A paper describes a structure:
Transglutaminases catalyze the formation of a stable isopeptide bond between an acyl group (e.g. a glutamine side chain) and an alkyl amine (e.g. a lysine side chain). In contrast to mammalian transglutaminases, bacterial enzymes do not require cofactors, such as Ca2+ or GTP, and function over a broad range of pH, buffers, and temperatures. The K. albida gene product is significantly smaller than MTG, amounting to a calculated molecular mass of 30.1 kDa and a molecular mass of 26.4 kDa in the active form.
To gain further insight into how the small KalbTG sequence can fold into such an efficient MTG and whether the substrate specificity as determined by the peptide array can be explained, we determined the crystal structure of KalbTG to a resolution of 1.9 Å. Superposition of KalbTG with its next closest homolog, the MTG from S. mobaraensis, shows a similar disc-shaped core structure (root mean square deviation of 1.5 Å) of a central β-sheet with flanking α-helices and a surface depression forming the active site cleft. However, KalbTG is more compact, having much shorter surface loops. The catalytic Cys-Asp-His triad of KalbTG is located at the bottom of the active site groove. The groove is wide enough to be covered by a kinked helical propeptide in the unprocessed enzyme, similar to what has been observed with the S. mobaraensis MTG zymogen, indicating that a similar zymogenic mechanism may be present in KalbTG. Strong difference electron density extending from Cγ of the catalytic Cys-82 showed that this residue is modified by a thiol-reactive compound, the origin of which is unknown. The electron density allows tracing of four atoms, and these were tentatively modeled as a β-mercaptoethanol disulfide adduct of Cys-82. As in all other transglutaminase structures, the catalytic Cys-82 in KalbTG is located at the N terminus of an α-helix, which reduces its pKa and increases its nucleophilicity for attack on the substrate glutamine. Of note, the catalytic Cys-82 in KalbTG is embedded 1.7 Å deeper in the active cleft than its S. mobaraensis MTG counterpart, raising the question of how the Gln side chain of the substrate peptide might reach it. However, these are difficult to distinguish from water in electron density maps, and no NH4+ has been identified in the KalbTG structure based on geometric criteria (four hydrogen bond acceptors in a tetrahedral geometry).
Author numbering: 2 to 226
The structure:
């Protein structure tokens, strides 16, 4: 039973009072949201994703495994879920990753595993991040506009230069949590107060905006309930 129903056929998004989202969240995860979790949620869009990763070792969603297209992220998700479904130790995970036709060509796959969480408690999850390319005002325009181009072979986007810099006069980022039960994207407007949670179609979440000129689809390990 999904956290929320799907969107109507003629709807691009549904808006949620934070209080109503939390109740739906608590029904779905079958437990009360903690104070640390509520505090993370109050950070806005980034909080929706941090709370859903369910990982106390994270304050920000990890960008290690970021890709130019949703389909690549979905393939990487399936590959990773297949490996952690065998309950590997960290060393067994590294070996498995090395043999996997998709994962072995990627950067940061080994780093993506949280060693202190047993692999039987993990699942690969997806979120989409929108951001501004000009992360250093000193960069030339050519550098800004090529730094986050996806690898022509693996579709992987190098995020190591990313500094959470906003386009001057705009919001720094958006994060959208991929709800694969209903095929919607969960985000928010900004941090508390007056935070509103959004449940959007991918097209609406991805729509042209002055704030952002880059979008990636990112795979990260979440901790199961
Ligand atoms: Cl739409």
């Amino acid at each position: 039973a999904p956290l929320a129903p799907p969107l109507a056929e003629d709807r691009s998004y549904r808006t949620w009072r934070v209080e109503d989202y939390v109740e739906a969240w608590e029904r779905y995860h079958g437990r009360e949201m903690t104070e640390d979790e509520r505090e993370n949620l109050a950070r806005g869009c980034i909080g929706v994703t941090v709370v859903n990763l369910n990982r106390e070792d994270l304050s920000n969603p990890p960008l290690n495994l970021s890709f130019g297209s949703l389909r690549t992220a979905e393939a990487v998700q399936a590959a990773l879920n297949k490996i952690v479904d065998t309950h590997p130790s960290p060393a067994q995970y590294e070996a498995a990753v090395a043999k996997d036709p998709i994962l072995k060509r990627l950067k940061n796959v080994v780093k993506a595993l949280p060693s202190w969480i047993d692999s039987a408690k993990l699942k690969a999850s997806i979120f989409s991040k929108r951001f501004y390319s000009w992360q250093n005002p000193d960069w030339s325009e050519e550098r800004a506009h090529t730094t986050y181009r996806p690898d022509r072979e693996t579709d992987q986007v190098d995020m190591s230069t990313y500094r959470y810099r906003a386009r001057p006069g705009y919001v720094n980022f958006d994060y959208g949590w991929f709800d694969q039960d209903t095929n919607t994207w969960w985000h928010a407007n900004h941090e508390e107060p007056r935070m509103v949670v959004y449940q959007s179609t991918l097209r609406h979440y991805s729509r042209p905006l002055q704030d952002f000129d880059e979008q990636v689809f990112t795979v990260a390990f979440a901790k199961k309930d």
